[PDB]
A paper describes a structure:
We assessed the performance of these methods in the identification of sulfur hydrogen bonds within the active site of the enzyme Alkyl hydroperoxide reductase E (AhpE) from Mycobacterium tuberculosis. To test our approach on structural coordinated atoms in space, we used the active site environment of the peroxidatic sulfur of peroxiredoxin AhpE, a single cysteine enzyme. AhpE reduces H2O2 to water but no H2O2 is present in the active site of the AhpE structures. Method 3, however, only finds the interaction with the water molecule, not the Arg116. It is predicted that stabilization of the Cys45 thiolate by Arg116 will promote its nucleophilic character, so that this Cys represents a catalytically active state of the enzyme.
Numbering used by the authors: -4 to 152
Amino acid sequence: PRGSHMLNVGATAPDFTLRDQNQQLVTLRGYRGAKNVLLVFFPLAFTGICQGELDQLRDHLPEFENDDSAALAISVGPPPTHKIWATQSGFTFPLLSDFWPHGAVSQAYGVFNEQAGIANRGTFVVDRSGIIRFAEMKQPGEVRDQRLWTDALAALT
């Protein structure tokens, strides 16, 4: 529980179990020993810079979801909201609901905007040991770079 003091590289990634857009439970620990995990926090479905960011993820998804890697997008929306958006947008990767308690996982990663009640645009790569290996927060206005995500992942083996 850290508001917006982003966790740093070398920290243990906080565990979570959240519902995806099809109401399945996704748990970060379940990847430990098996894949590196890209976590893409985003503020609000249907609006903002994050439509373009998630569209880049989509447009390069086989590079992020494979035998070595998984990608999970996280926001405060509940599953029905993420289902509709994912269907319209062509998103087939998990969108997870940090919905109730509201923003709890975003807060644990230090990427929550307490004033607005939404996640900031933070991104992490978690290795097979559960350790944060890459961390960023983008300041209002600048869009994240999906090429940098793939490069971070490629370095992890």
